[PDB]
Amino acid sequence: YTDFENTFQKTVEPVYQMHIKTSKDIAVLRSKEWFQLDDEDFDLLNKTLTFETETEVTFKNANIFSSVKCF
Amino acid sequence: IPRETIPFLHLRKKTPAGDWKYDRQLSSLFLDGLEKAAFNGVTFKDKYV
């Protein structure tokens, strides 16, 4: 089969746990457009974060995604 | 203690420039303690020297 226009996928990812130690980690996190905090001023230093995400992709061909959405 | 007088025994305080100068308040603390000692005696119990 090669009708990739008809294909879609949905995976629930493993829970990822991150321990925020330094301001370097906070700077790295805040650089990511996708890391959106409800309270922009939240103090993340010395906090443990868990990310519970889901990925929904559509395929352009075997190896390349026509769209990727993680939330 | 008369004003404009340095007591024979006094304490000093360091200034932002780093030099130590006579301090009326600290010296008053020290001299008041010395007076209390001379009158009532001072204890040193529980002191390890």
């Binding site: 301001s23 370097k24 700077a27 790295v28 | 932002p16 420039a17 780093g18």
Partner: protein
């Protein structure tokens, strides 16, 4: 005996230890944050 002061005015800076530590800390912070952020951006570009 002569005493020459060639300290260039540094004696007037208050709390020199803290001031220099602050200066150095701000410089290392800038450097490390920039380096790590650039590395992460490079990895995300390469994976995307």
């Amino acid at each position: 005996p002569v005493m020459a002061d060639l300290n260039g005015g540094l004696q007037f800076v208050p709390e020199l230890k803290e001031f220099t530590a602050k200066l150095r800390k701000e410089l290392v912070e800038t450097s490390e944050v920039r380096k790590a952020v650039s590395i992460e951006t490079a990895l995300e570009h390469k994976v995307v």
